[PDB]
Amino acid sequence: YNLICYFTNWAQYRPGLGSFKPDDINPCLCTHLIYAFAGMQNNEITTIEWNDVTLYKAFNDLKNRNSKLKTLLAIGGWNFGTAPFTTMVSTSQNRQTFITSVIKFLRQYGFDGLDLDWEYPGSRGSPPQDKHLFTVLVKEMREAFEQEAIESNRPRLMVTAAVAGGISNIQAGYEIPELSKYLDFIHVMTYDLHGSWEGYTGENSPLYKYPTETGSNAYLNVDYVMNYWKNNGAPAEKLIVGFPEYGHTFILRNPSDNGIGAPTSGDGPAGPYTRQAGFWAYYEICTFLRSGATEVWDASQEVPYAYKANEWLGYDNIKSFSVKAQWLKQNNFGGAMIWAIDLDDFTGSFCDQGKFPLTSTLNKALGIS
Template sequence: MLTVAVVLLGLSLRLSETVTVCYLGSWAVWRPDAGKYDVDQIDPFLCTHVIYSYAQISETTWEAIPLEPYYDLCENWGLCAYDRFTGLKKVNPELKTLLSVGGSARLMSQVSADPLKREIFISSAVSLAKNYSFDGLDTDWMYPGDENGIPEDKENYILLLTEFREVLTKEGLLLTAAVSLQKTIIDKAYDIPAMSAVTDLLLLRGYNFHGTWSTYTHHHAPLYGHPGDTGNNVYLNINYGLEYWVSGGADKSKLVLGLGTYGICWTLDSMDDTGYFASAPQAGDPGPYTSSLGILGYNEICEMQRDSEWTVVLDPDMNEPYAFYQGNKIWCGYEDALSMWVKGQYARSQGLAGTMVWSLETDDFSGSCTGRSYNLIRSMDEGFQNLPFSTPVPPTVAPETTPEAVVTPACSEGSYYLEDIQCDRYWHCVNGNAIPGKCSPGLVWDTAVESCSWPDNVDTSHCVMPGEDTTTTTTTTTTTTTELTTSSAPQPECDKEMNYFVIHPLCNKYWWCLSGEAVLGTCHGGLVWAPNSRVCLPVAQGSTEDCSMA
């Protein structure tokens, strides 16, 4: 039985000394319905560093240029996303905002190999950072030395980073780099001691170890290897990759463990084999928001499990869940709140600088599914901060809303903001067009700083707070809250040498014994815990005789 390293070390890491790095995939603003995510929805206090992904490379001038000028910039009546992103610092002055640059492995290889192209690229990237008030740059290169590059990429990448470092240091700006945890990539791509020396933070991609390029199921982000792993699979896990970076000379104080708020999904050959290494030659169906074969955001997975009868499996030999659905034979390995918490604890136990997540927009950012906004990211951070694991109670009934009689304000030429009757909403006037915006849960619009802020900082006497009735909308939300106390459900004593499950008095809960620690788990979406099969199942398939449904 695998022993999970959930070691609660008394590290002398104060909150101000740890980092929580969150990436934004800026293209999420074009996603439909509840998947749409704009800059203004970012909680400025959720992360210590936020990274805007990304600025691309021009194939004609070799400059770093905006990926989508209309969205990124204000010029030509654009949507000003760069300015709104760095403007989050008006609400939280401690927040650091960075711009990720690169994206194309082929172009990064060509730029890094040529001194003149490096100079142009670096100069233009730093100018972008300074002109739009970013606090630094992040280099996005997946991956040096692969089929889109040349063997000299490993050495040339250090030249690029070193020259970036020299210019950024003069400007007082940060330099980070996102890197792989896969041994075969590390060997080809990175001079570990040199990269550690020239960067402020190295963001370790603790995901995409497995994918639909393989014809069998496996979790894409395992903390440790599966007992059935053989050959190269033995190296494809977070623990091995981290140890490889450290043994190669990386400075632990600069290493940040990156986790993913999404799942990798396959289509099973047969529902007779639904475990690890099951035959699955095809990628899973795309989701309604991400629209990508073989990938589902956690927000999509969570909603699908809420609305359909998925089977969720917690393999006691692993730290991450997987789930499958008979309707379309989809199988997904993904992170849930508990696995993110466990990995946050792991990063703490290893003495790392903090944690990173890709990405903000694929978490349950609204909290509509789990009952807490950004539940995965918050759980990850709570694990790293050595806080107890907690599971919010999800909404049991979706809000019943009457259609809103939206009144669009009249806008004149220019770019400016207008207030809305609802405190957490606003309008962005751009060249006569009124574009609606909405703040993250818990925040309200502050016209004085043209950003979302905490209600205590804003005069809300002229608007209606979220949840209150207005003349144009009526919202009724039914939420069931169940409070568990140690007296009503005492924690079991756990064997430190084994990982296993213990039943709970409530049917939708269970205890997971991890290296002597009893962690409370919850089955969401109306499912109940099935102790014999160790999964969450619909009530009709579970056994509820010995537990309470209350």
């Protein structure tokens, strides 16, 4: 199995003990580390942070302590939008400018592949033709990587993609049978399945549907999404399950109404380290739980939730990671990917569960070490 771990180049700016850089990564935990994110300028891949080149060196130097580790560079992400991707795939010339820039960039800085994180072809303003042009891009990138390995006499650079977990976005965005022929791995973002945007409580990454859910609400679970990809053309061995090391937060309209689906208001509280409404890192979650929150196991969906006063949290813990790891193994998937290792309790001093408690759980369950 593969354990693919995302690292984010803005974690360095979090205050105090939240600050995280590549030297804080245990090189033995994952099989692949993915660097989020590169950007794009004039259809060429670029850095985005002033010290990316330094962090790239520190990131790929982790391979000096694990000969099997591979690293990839992710381009895009949610906040990158779609317009630069649309423009880049719109002509063969723009695509070749991009592919050429990617090859030089990955080889120069020491990466083993590219993770495409366009969120998403055919949605969020991307026009309908981008569904097919994404296939064209991935095929041309795969073929260019094949030819560069021949011409450079080095192992082929990998091409992977992080892909939608929402069915509407999947249907608008991906030619799954053809895409799956050229991608090395498909990183399915089976999280953010519920959150404050809905106006009621729900789990970030439930394994199964809640018993009353029907119709399109019944799409919002890991089991359905992964089987959607599998049964629409993707080989299971290429499919990687997404595991969040964070949770979503909500404000309950009434503290007495605190189950799944309870009405909520606003964007949800922010944490002192991640400082973003609606979102807590696992180490921020531990601070909340320790202060007297009520903990509930959502038995039907195999995930925990917690609440205190009018604050409600849908999240993952060791138990839920363990259940979903055994589920992905029993369904023959290629492994797991984590968003993101800088959100684990990497110091071990927030959760009293040891260093990297969530990532270590998957390392053990997937037989990584």
